[PDB]
Design a protein around this ligand. Structure first.
Ligand SMILES: C[N+](C)(C)CCOP(=O)(O)O
Ligand SMILES: C[N+](C)(C)CCOP(=O)(O)O
Ligand SMILES: C[N+](C)(C)CCOP(=O)(O)O
Ligand SMILES: C[N+](C)(C)CCOP(=O)(O)O
Ligand SMILES: C[N+](C)(C)CCOP(=O)(O)O
Ligand SMILES: C[N+](C)(C)CCOP(=O)(O)O
Ligand SMILES: C[N+](C)(C)CCOP(=O)(O)O
Ligand SMILES: C[N+](C)(C)CCOP(=O)(O)O
Lengths: 88, 88, 88, 88
């Protein structure tokens, strides 16, 4: 099945596939981990979440604001809160 | 005679042939072990139980979900409860 | 694809899935290993080969001859030569 | 500009963005590195090359064969020769 982001595993919140406790990226099929997980294929990795809030401002695309080198995007609607992100 | 699954032997519940107390896999001929048993041949091993509950969801076939290597199935109607399984 | 039995891997001949160099049973998809392999599902394990030669005699079913406890079968047409077998 | 795959840098052939000589993945803008390069964004990474030769066989799609974890594809027409790949 599909990955559920974010998911909580051992009290740790994940907004993307993780190598936490693994040799290969995996994701939970449930927000609250109950034993269902799978290794991640390219399509399974978390995609940019638009729009997202950063510094109290709304972003509709990848941005260099707050980075100034490589554009990035949030992996949740509110980066200020979750701080989950990835380079684009 | 025929294996009875699950069977209880020395405080352990077995849903398949076991090496519990032996070198070669065996099974009890009674739900509650009372001295009747036999060594398991290929046909004696437990078969998949469908459907089965896993991660609070109903599965009608084997699944690769939750396994680091191969598709598997529960050996009881409720894997979450019994945790008994085999690869497919 | 399908397993090829027997297959040679690092000069070792295998007539069934093996854990040789692995944490889980696997098989080569080519008689002469060239990098193609897969983990084995139940259907992939080597099945009895009938008829098979043992002690210069032909066997059409699993036999206890030469064992006298649990019936077994060869995993190749000529056990005398290959010595590959499994309990039935 | 755009990545050129494969590209040669300091005696190494790269069929995808690389961390060779850096902390962040990059790629040469020329087959033979001559000073033109850029850091890779998601879109810059090499894409699967179909069909590709693997184990002397022709593959038209990604395959789980040969991988301990995930389906993959070659980054060149001949994996046996180049050994360049990526997960799918
Ligand atoms: C980390 N993992 C989810 C890939 C495997 C271990 O899972 P679990 O044994 O904590 O349920
Ligand atoms: C997400 N980021 C680290 C790339 C840039 C924003 O950084 P910060 O202002 O939240 O520290
Ligand atoms: C002896 N042993 C502890 C390894 C296994 C079987 O013990 P028991 O619980 O059946 O008495
Ligand atoms: C534990 N399980 C029944 C969910 C799956 C089998 O686990 P694994 O040992 O193949 O990774
Ligand atoms: C043993 N194995 C085939 C599962 C993996 C290692 O394969 P290889 O690296 O010798 O080609
Ligand atoms: C195959 N076997 C070991 C079960 C019985 C035959 O043994 P052997 O006569 O080849 O030694
Ligand atoms: C320095 N290093 C050996 C770790 C990696 C890069 O070396 P080089 O071959 O590019 O000169
Ligand atoms: C090496 N390969 C390209 C055949 C497959 C990937 O290997 P693995 O590291 O996922 O097991």
């Amino acid at each position: 099945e599909e990955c559920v982001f974010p998911f909580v595993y051992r009290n740790r919140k994940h907004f993307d596939c993780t190598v936490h406790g693994s040799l290969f990226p995996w994701c939970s099929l449930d927000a609250d981990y109950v034993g269902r997980w799978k290794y991640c294929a390219q399509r399974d990795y978390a995609k940019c979440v638009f729009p997202f809030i950063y510094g109290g401002k709304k972003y509709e695309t990848c941005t260099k604001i707050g980075s100034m080198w490589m554009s990035w995007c949030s992996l949740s609607p509110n980066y200020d809160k979750d701080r989950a992100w990835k380079y684009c």
